[PDB]
Amino acid sequence: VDPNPYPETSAGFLSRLFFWWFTKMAIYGYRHPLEEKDLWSLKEDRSQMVVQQLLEAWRKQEKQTARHKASPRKPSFLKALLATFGSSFLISACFKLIQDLLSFINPQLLSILIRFISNPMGPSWWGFLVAGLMFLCSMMQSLILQHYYHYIFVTGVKFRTGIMGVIYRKALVITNSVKRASTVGEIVNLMSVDAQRFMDLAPFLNLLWSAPLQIILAIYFLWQNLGPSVLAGVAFMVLLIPLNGAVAVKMRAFQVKQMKLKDSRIKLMSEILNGIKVLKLYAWEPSFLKQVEGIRQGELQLLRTAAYLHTTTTFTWMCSPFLVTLITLWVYVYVDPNNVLDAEKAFVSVSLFNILRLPLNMLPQLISNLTQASVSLKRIQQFLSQEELDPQSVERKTISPGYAITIHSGTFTWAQDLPPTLHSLDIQVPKGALVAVVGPVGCGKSSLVSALLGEMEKLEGKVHMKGSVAYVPQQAWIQNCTLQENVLFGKALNPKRYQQTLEACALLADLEMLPGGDQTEIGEKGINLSGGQRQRVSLARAVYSDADIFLLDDPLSAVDSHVAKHIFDHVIGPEGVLAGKTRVLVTHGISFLPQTDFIIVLADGQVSEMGPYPALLQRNGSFANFLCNEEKAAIGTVELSVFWDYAKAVGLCTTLAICLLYVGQSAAAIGANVWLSAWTNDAMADSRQNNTSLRLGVYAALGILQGFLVMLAAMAMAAGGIQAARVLHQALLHNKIRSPQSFFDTTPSGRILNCFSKDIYVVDEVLAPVILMLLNSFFNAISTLVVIMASTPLFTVVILPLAVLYTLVQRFYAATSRQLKRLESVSRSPIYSHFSETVTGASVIRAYNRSRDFEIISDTKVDANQRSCYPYIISNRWLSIGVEFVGNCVVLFAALFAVIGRSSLNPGLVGLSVSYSLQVTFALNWMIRMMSDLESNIVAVERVKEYSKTETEAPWVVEGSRPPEGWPPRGEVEFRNYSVRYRPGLDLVLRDLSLHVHGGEKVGIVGRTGAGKSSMTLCLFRILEAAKGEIRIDGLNVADIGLHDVRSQLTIIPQDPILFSGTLRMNLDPFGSSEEDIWWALELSHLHTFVSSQPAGLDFQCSEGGENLSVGQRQLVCLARALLRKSRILVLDEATAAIDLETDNLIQATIRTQFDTCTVLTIAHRLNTIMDYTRVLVLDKGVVAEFDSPANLIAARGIFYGMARDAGLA
Template sequence: MLAVSPEVKTNPLQKANFCSRLFVWWLNPLFKIGHKRKLEPDDMYSVLPEDRSQHLGKELQRHWDQEVKRAQKDAQEPSLMKAVIKCYWKSYLIWGMFTFLEEGTRVVQPIFLGKMISYVENSNSVTLHEAYCYSAGLSACVLMWAVLHHLYFYHMQRVGMRLRVALCHMIYRKALRLSSPAMGKTTTGQIVNLLSNDVNRFDQVTMFLHYLWVGPLQAVTVTALLWMEIGISCLAGMAVLIILLLFQSCFGKLFSSLRSETSALTDKRIRTMNEIITGIRTIKMNAWEKSFIDLITRLRSKEISKILKSSYLRGLNLASFFTVSKIMIFVTFITNELLDNWIIASQVFVVVMLFEALRFLSTLYFPMAVEKVSEAVISLRRIKNFLSLDEIPQLNTQLPSDGEMMVDMQDFTAFWDEELDSPTLKGISFTVRLGELLTVVGPVGAGKSSLLRALLGELPPSQGKVSVHGRIAYVSQQPWVFPGTVRSNILFGKKYEEERYEEVIKACALEEDLQNLKEKDLTVIGDGGTPLSEGQKARVSLARAVYQDADIYLLDDPLSAVDPRVSRHLFEQCIRQALKEKITILVTHQLQYLKDASQILILKDDKTVERGTYSEFLKSGVDIFSPFEKGNKQPASSPVLGTPTLMSESLVQSLPSPRPSLKDAAPEDQDTENIQVTLPLEDYLEGKVGFKTYKSYFTAGAGWPVITFLILVNITAQVAYILQDWWLAFWANVQSDLYSGALIKEDVDTMIILNWCLRVYSGLTVSTIVFGITRSLLIIYILVNSSQTWHNKILESILRASVLFFNSNPIGRILNRFSKDIGHMDDLLPLIFLDFIQLRSALE
């Protein structure tokens, strides 16, 4: 747990006035700094109190707990979606009204523009004063739309951020509380995928959610305005929109199904990748790199096939945004022509602008909302399933009425798996009070670790009871450290008190070890830091527990990983001296310390063989060594530095958490104690992205012939898109001449011109559709294929890297490349490029 630097920069949003909030002026100081130099993390403002993860997580957790209780009462499945709605409905409602106003100003703009054009065409229909009023109204609507649009997206992104942070808080909290049976129902890969991919869906779904109801409402309003403008012909164009929405509804269902399948395949790939990275040294010792590369490649191929299908659906949705307004305008004017209706320039502008307003909402935001909601529902379901897993029962550590701290277990029987005939623990009884030391001994597999797990509440009783009164500190059989300094590993979030800290260091025999480290207790250890031996990690874990100053200490064989001299020091200075006023329960195979114990509990075959003091055993003639004569040959207590230690299968099953242990040290010819490994920072680029990067990205997905073809298709689509508007204006001028009498419709030349206008306009519309869809699908194909190529390159490079690479880079950092970053390349980048190309084309 690394120290957190104090947040000294107050967030100016807290004191910003109305205008500053409206126009986001409170960010100007940050923009000025960014203009002068590169922004650093220290330049960022502190997080607002209402945006802190603890506050957000507790708030959503409260609603989730209420939903779980309601579901249990009604014998139903709890709904995480209901909890989210209850927590955030007020924010959604407020900003939903902003969306309504924003789209209202967009719809009114074509009306004002049409009146202004009518004045230019025929000044008798509109007075100059009215034209000025319409012009002012149009300007006000444009300004209001710009302000409302960006305010809405900013605040809805903030709501999405809050939801994401709250869900992350709940997932982290749940991961720390999972019971052992529940841990068998999930994997590290699934948890990583939930935190890196699934929660990110809520950043996007909140932005588009309101368009699910604003979209249909706007469509009805636009239809009414079109009817007033050109009559029944508008229904033909709206029919195109309805057909498109039906297709998009089918796409949404298919996309939801593909997303579920993709998530399951992604979980499996990430889980396998995590196992490979964790066991990379074993893989390299046996030269298994090729086999595991093939394994991940096969998993990735199945995943990418689903991703490609879902991406094609997304591409068709975005292609519809590019083409549907052109189709609607085409069908509307063709129908108008078939009905022998006239159309003038002002009507053309109004109709085109109304359809353009409808295009953004009904063919971009509405389909995006359907897609994002489908994704979010799948992610909510996956998160809900994880949050519904069983937790460890919360222990009642409050002191009894007499105030006496104690640990009491009476006739305790428990099963790890109730389907088994033999219990894990059977008929265990003992009582330990303040200042007493209970040593638990027995052969391997006798249930000693399970006994401590029962005291922690992780092994619920099927018979008997267990009472624990006081704060607990637990030292697991498998010592662990996290990435950070030695000091932060020992403090574990507690305040640094120098005198107490030095006492703990001395009691846990860490003084000499810290002297051998270059940065002393500020040396970075853990994943990617300085390697530690098993004995050193065991002492750091013990020091962490001792520094917490708990009431009850559960020590699961911490003496087995150290040599006899250090073992004696730990027992005398730490267990007997530093913890002399505590309740201590020590699991050990070091029988020489039994005579110093207040009580001895001997386990064999999951039940108590004997219980008493050392002197009582001597007086009664009980041979306390007999249970160890068979099947209890222990390995050397102090492993050779630099020699990898393998975990047994039974040990892995008894671990309290899925946290991987760093078992591997340096090569045998190196002095582990004095190795200094600096945790490297991740490289990042700043400034503009160079052409070389874009070139590498695209050429990884296809060769130059395909890319050249894509460029030609894009140019053709854009030319057809622009020419269609230009040709429509030409056709409208011809219609205006007919309307004014400048041309005679029965004239042969006029008929030829009208037929030619119709044919060219039809050809341009078909070209826009064909080339627009082809462009979308081709971009998706190239960029998804590029993602697959880069994944395979990264995989090959990672598995071919030296062991030093894995020593200096945390597992989480490596795994993040294969989860979050690859996820962005699969889903986000293809859509961003396609969206950029289409929007840029629309602006040209």
């Protein structure tokens, strides 16, 4: 059958009520990695079926829409979504009415226990029954809610897969104008945004009837307990919905302001990363750092003015429950003097204030989602009802005799409003005749091919065509698959043809040029083929199809003219493979006209000439005018060390204070109730007390001490996470800028810029708000468990068994959930990439009669996300049935221990223990969601930590070794006994060099390819350390002096000119240290006339990569920075390979005239540049051939002479 089947199918009453069938995937995920082939197979939910049902309705209603508009009553998707999925929502309503009405039993059974502990003369059986019936009503409420959630969430995965398939079946029949009116980006956003909103509205649709009920019964059952006063309490819960929203608007304002400053830092980093060569060689690295720090300081201050908007959310979650209990039990005591609080009317009016809170807090979200989704159903109903291509404008069943294409009196217009492109066209191409439709400028002709494929409106006329059609478009379409697929579109591989077709189009050299061969992937996610390459693949698809009629549109566009004749003779023309086909070629040239059997030339939209090429010459009418014209990383567990690194960064001291202020808030709260639970016993023990002031006041103060202490903690985990961000980024930017040259070359820049963008973002704006919620929920649960154990001291035995069961469900859940939420992210993207190709290429997909095949390639892509969405929706139900059993066992054991020990408890303590215990599940579910976000998001402190530790280059400046006074002036660089290599683990690239250069003579370096000439420039600047020997300059080894001082004193006109974005003020000088010289050198380099021309002058803006300035000007720009440096030695590099002579000529005279009194060492990419140099060093395979004059080398027949004859210079 199938190797892996949806487990549900086979399960019994007890494994399908408690979701025990997800157990095996859960155990497997933690230990082994999960892959797309271990995900279960969908039930026979498969898109093919869901889409069928949604379409059937639209058709009935739209078929009846001809009737509905005729009786406007436009067809409505809403009536189809409701007929198709409407009976299922009605079942889900009943599971919600039973959870809503079985959640008010437990608050009312509590009132019976707090009215038993009061009567000593009651048989103990009454108590043990209320303890059991308070666990059964709790079990029946969980196993029902978690079975409504399975239906509401699975219905979401089926609205998205049904409004994502009625859209992809309309894009393939929509007329040309609608595609032109809306950008393809907007049309693939009726699946990306609009269908996905329908999946997220699904959970909050049955809250338009529940929320307005749980809030109208809870207020009634609190009217009975506390009187009209409970109305004040609800006001302080209905006036926090406005306030929490106001904090949120002020947060977005902060986030948008930040997204401006972060994007600036990433851009200056990108430019530093993509130029770390010249930034290091010139000593500019100390300066480009201060530019990045200045932008980081601005980002850090803006994060300080957003701690205050996160302390406010911790105050509402932690201290809002107490404030409703104070306003309510304050108004009640005043409103009338006689009212007396008892345990029932103070701990049953607290368990009924929690049931009101989850529903009243989700009333704002329901209005947002049900209002964003009215916009979507308006868009998803416009696309579904726009006009469609006319299926029978062209006639394919039969044809007029001895012909294939006949159009009589046909006029075609792209749009009803637009001017008609073609008028009364008449054509009758005979079978197998090459007809070339050539016409003058004014374009058109195009409308001939698109008219025949049926893609324009036949306002008047008739078109008849017979046979299969193959269309080569004006702009080619390449599918996202392999080249071998593009060549055979939906065809079986006859090897002979595959050889005949590619080679006949000469794609054979191209296939060898393809790195992966013909099997390579082409498309957006593929090697980018050349424009001419694109046209050839398209022609190939057609030639393989072996179709009866070939409508070719300007295939000969980007093709090489010489190569094109070969394609014409081999495939298009009479001697070519396509010789019995009927071909209509729309071309704009006279070269191929003689070959054509007959030529259809037309003027405006009216045919002018219908004759052979000889006839065209004799006609001499407008034809004459036309002629003249690892595995662990995939699981992702986080080691306990990655949490000791965040702590050391925040501060070990700030971390103690956050805890000792959260263990001081708990005490205050766990005591403020021990005061209510001593005030609610005042009436029983003594008939009347006058102490209501001393008892209201103290409770209000102990509550305010909880609030003062939690705000001080929340403000110390939000100002202690902006000390981690400063410490962690400031060190990545320092180790990375100083990393040795090899790291930049071996490691792609894309990875380094990932760390300075996405990972430094999490460390700053995500971890601090998710560690203030793991703590909040951990302390709402530790307080709740301390009261029960103190009130009934034996409840302790149960805490250790239930804690093991709670840890095990979290360990197995997080591991599996993470893997499933990654397999889903990778899967979702393909569904959208296919839609964009179907909208862009729908004319080739339809003309080759392959529309169905392309509707099934979608269903195999919308049935690969579902196979990973379903396993996740079940996983959050196998956990929610484990946290709910370790939360219903606290209600049974906190009410089976009060009844065992009735004699020592009092009505109030039994109320305080049991009341709290009904709220363990909310706290425990938040602690599992928040512990999972921290483990997923704290991988970032691991990467920032590992990039920061790479090895570093020698000190930029070392004291005690400062450079000697005026050390460069002797100007002689002696290489002595030196050996060097690019990376540890490679063979020496230079060997034992021994040289002495007289100060100032121009020693050119001439070398064979593979002689490591490029090592010479790097070795002098200590980019690469000396493996053995020295490069002492003027008696001073460069090794002893600090790397930075030596580099600044020397001039390098680098091979690649780089202009980082900014100002010519900075590009010429970042330090900026002569006020007037910047112009003088620039004209010396013939650049000032261009600089003065632009009105701005200095500070003319230079784009990213200095793109605005032309390469030639940029090369001189290098000469300019150098012109300012004025060092004793000058080092050129790769002077010219493709650069123009005028700049090249300019450089050599200037460097000869201005750099004359200096040692000049020029590596030479062309031996032509090195002429008249006093002493020339020839290098071969790391050996110096000789040190003598160039003419002398020629007379002595050195390797240089062999190169000189290669140039032929002499």
